[PDB]
Enzyme design. Structure first.
Site, PDB file in Angstrom:
ATOM      1  N   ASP A  86       0.819  -1.207   0.000  1.00 50.93           N
ATOM      2  CA  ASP A  86       0.000   0.000   0.000  1.00 50.93           C
ATOM      3  C   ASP A  86       0.856   1.261   0.000  1.00 50.93           C
ATOM      4  O   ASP A  86       1.853   1.364   0.731  1.00 50.93           O
ATOM      5  CB  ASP A  86      -0.869   0.015   1.252  1.00 50.93           C
ATOM      6  N   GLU A 136       1.793  -0.789  -4.945  1.00 49.02           N
ATOM      7  CA  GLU A 136       0.738   0.112  -5.403  1.00 49.02           C
ATOM      8  C   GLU A 136       1.373   1.338  -6.024  1.00 49.02           C
ATOM      9  O   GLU A 136       2.109   2.068  -5.360  1.00 49.02           O
ATOM     10  CB  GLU A 136      -0.185   0.555  -4.290  1.00 49.02           C
TER      11      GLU A 136
END
Ligand SMILES: [Ca+2]
Ligand SMILES: [Ca+2]
Ligand SMILES: [Ca+2]
EC number: 3.2.1.135
Length: 626
Positions: free
Chosen positions: A356, A385
């Protein structure tokens, strides 16, 4: 073609698929033999020109004529780049007397390119199961409630002055008046995922699960981590996770599976004890005192209320990784019992991390992280990400295996099929533009990385594909046929396989309608068929990619996926009416008189004059294989 002072661009081809490159993930001691296709008799010479990072110089390798293809239409020329440990980049010079063309990842050019060279990165491997797999993304609260005993109830707890709200399965995700959207709980859990492994692994056939965050946190999304070491009690306990992992890994209940967890390492939640903004712990967090044991875990501009965070969300204070050997680097990855290692080691043994917010953590940290992860399990995946070109974290083989393919997949697919960007703003592209966008984005990446990209139609941070498509399920069919025959890991965001709708967060996280989870739903039936097809043909997972048709008048896109064994022409109709298409399968060296079968329907065709003629419905496709 002939030796006539003219290089014919339509005959040229190279990529790093099996017909053209014998060593796409070479070690230090494996040489790389490359083949360049041309029309038969078209050229007089060709050279591989490669940059070697070992000596910061170009090197030229003359090529020789190798062979004809079986149809007699093409020559292959060959040359070998020597074995060494160094990263190298290559292009081709192609000569027919006074005519020269150049060729690299971006295709042919009249001028010598200086970008989009092909990559050779010795000793860089991405996990082959990721290249060859199909992934299914689950937002745990919304997939399946396997056990009511762990459900968060209305008023169970409060977070920042608002109580939690339980909502009934199938109801609106929006919090009722006075409640907060991030504190709405439907009850989905790990036991529910376990109970639905037959749906995932057999009814669909996906073999990789990717979960949104599952560790203790007050919200329904759990990107605001409170304890990395504990499964959130709403979702189960650590023993439930162990049981789920073992059932995912089982070959007795479907194909062997893999689990990728969401690693939220850029920031914690504001309720993590290290920060402790609301004094939920006896210990003193960084927010509570400048003398906190964890004060240096964060960055304050003006203590205590102005600090580094994810995107300005005060609930998501940003971790200070300091320099090598720091306590934060320790707890996240270096320590023997770090977060990253804990879940990769027994008794968990998960198969990867989705990183993330990864762009906000520097390249040095990601390089150290790779060493930590791969030292535990060299076949554990690292997917970062990033919404743009992730070349900076992939193309030296020292950080991520791949990235979330917003830029190379989700966006161009959205704009081509739906006429919307993935946020549902108006943004349309033609077929020629779609093909160009796809080529340039593939060329950003090494081949192994391309093959490992996470290719989803929708996810938890964008609008649902079926909403962008205005509820036309045939637009989903078209998107699925492309997705399941393209370069990169097909990734199904839970519900997209049946046509689940949804706008922006939180409405992209609707509870899954289990009445639709059968082949009586036509999108589910097509999804299963396509996953079966992809699993039948290595050419669809790791084969070459060649553009065949870009027709902006009839909205027809065709491309080939092909290797030493199979040749597959995919034909996609993005118009609203049927078109009968003459598919130039000669470009894939499908021989005259051979048969191809549309694997979607079982309909058989015979190649004539280099062509297969097929009728394709609007917003549909054919997968013509031999
Ligand atoms: Ca020529
Ligand atoms: Ca539950
Ligand atoms: Ca405290």
């Amino acid at each position: 073609a002939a030796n006539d002072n003219n290089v014919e661009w339509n005959g040229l081809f190279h990529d790093q698929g099996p017909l053209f490159d014998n060593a796409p993930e070479p070690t230090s001691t494996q040489s790389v033999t490359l083949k360049l296709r041309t029309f038969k008799g078209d050229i007089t010479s060709a050279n591989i020109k490669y940059w070697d990072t070992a000596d910061n110089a170009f090197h030229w390798v003359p090529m020789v004529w190798d062979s004809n293809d079986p149809t007699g239409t093409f020559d292959y020329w060959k040359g070998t780049i020597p074995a060494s440990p160094s990263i190298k980049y290559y292009r081709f010079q192609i000569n027919d007397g006074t005519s020269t063309a150049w060729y690299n990842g971006n295709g042919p050019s009249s001028t010598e390119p200086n970008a989009d060279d092909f990559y050779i990165i010795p000793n860089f491997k991405t996990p082959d199961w990721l290249k060859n797999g199909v992934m299914y993304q689950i937002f745990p609260d919304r997939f399946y409630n396997g056990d009511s005993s762990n459900d968060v109830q209305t008023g169970s707890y409060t977070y920042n002055g608002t109580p939690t709200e339980k909502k009934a399965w199938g109801s609106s995700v929006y919090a009722d008046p006075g409640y907060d959207n991030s504190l709405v709980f439907f009850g989905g859990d790990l036991a529910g995922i376990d109970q639905k492994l037959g749906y995932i692994k057999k009814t669909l056939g996906a073999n990789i699960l990717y979960l949104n965050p599952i560790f203790k946190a007050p919200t329904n999304h759990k990107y605001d981590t409170q304890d990395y070491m504990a499964v959130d009690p709403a979702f189960g306990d650590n023993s439930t996770l162990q049981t789920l992992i073992n059932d995912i890994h089982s070959t007795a209940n479907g194909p062997k599976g893999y689990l990728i967890l969401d690693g939220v390492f850029n920031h914690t939640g504001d309720s993590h004890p290290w920060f402790d903004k609301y004094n939920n712990f006896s210990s003193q967090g960084a927010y509570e005192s400048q003398s906190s044991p964890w004060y240096n875990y964060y960055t304050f501009y003006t203590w205590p209320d102005s600090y580094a965070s994810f995107l300005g969300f005060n609930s998501l204070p940003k971790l200070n990784y300091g320099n090598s050997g720091s306590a934060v680097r320790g707890v996240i990855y270096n320590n023997s019992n770090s977060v990253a290692k804990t879940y990769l080691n027994p008794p968990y043994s998960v198969d990867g991390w989705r990183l993330d917010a990864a762009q906000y953590v520097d390249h040095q940290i990601w390089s150290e992280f790779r060493n930590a992860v791969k030292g535990v399990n060299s076949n554990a995946a690292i997917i970062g990400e990033y919404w743009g070109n992730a070349n900076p974290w992939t193309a030296q083989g020292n950080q991520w295996d791949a990235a979330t393919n917003f830029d190379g997949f989700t966006q161009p697919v959205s704009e081509w099929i739906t006429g919307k960007d993935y946020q549902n703003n108006s943004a349309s592209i033609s077929t020629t533009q779609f093909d160009s966008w796809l080529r340039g984005t593939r060329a950003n990446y090494p081949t192994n990385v391309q093959q490992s990209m996470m290719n989803f139609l929708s996810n938890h941070d964008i609008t649902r594909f079926a909403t962008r498509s205005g509820g036309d399920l045939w637009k989903t069919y078209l998107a699925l046929i492309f997705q399941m025959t393209y370069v990169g890991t097909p990734t199904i965001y839970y519900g997209d396989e049946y046509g689940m709708q949804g706008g922006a967060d939180p409405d992209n996280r609707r509870s899954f309608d289990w009445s639709q989870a059968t082949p009586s739903n036509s999108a589910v039936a097509l999804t299963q068929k396509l996953i079966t097809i992809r699993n039948q043909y290595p050419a669809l997972r790791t084969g070459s990619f060649m553009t065949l048709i870009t027709d902006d008048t009839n909205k027809i896109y065709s491309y080939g996926r092909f290797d030493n064994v199979n040749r597959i022409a995919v034909v996609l109709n993005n118009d609203s009416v049927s078109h009968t298409v003459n598919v130039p399968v000669w470009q894939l060296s499908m021989p005259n008189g051979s048969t191809v079968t549309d694997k979607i329907t079982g309909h058989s065709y015979t190649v004539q004059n280099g062509m297969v003629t097929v009728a394709v419905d609007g917003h549909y496709g054919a997968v013509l294989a031999q």
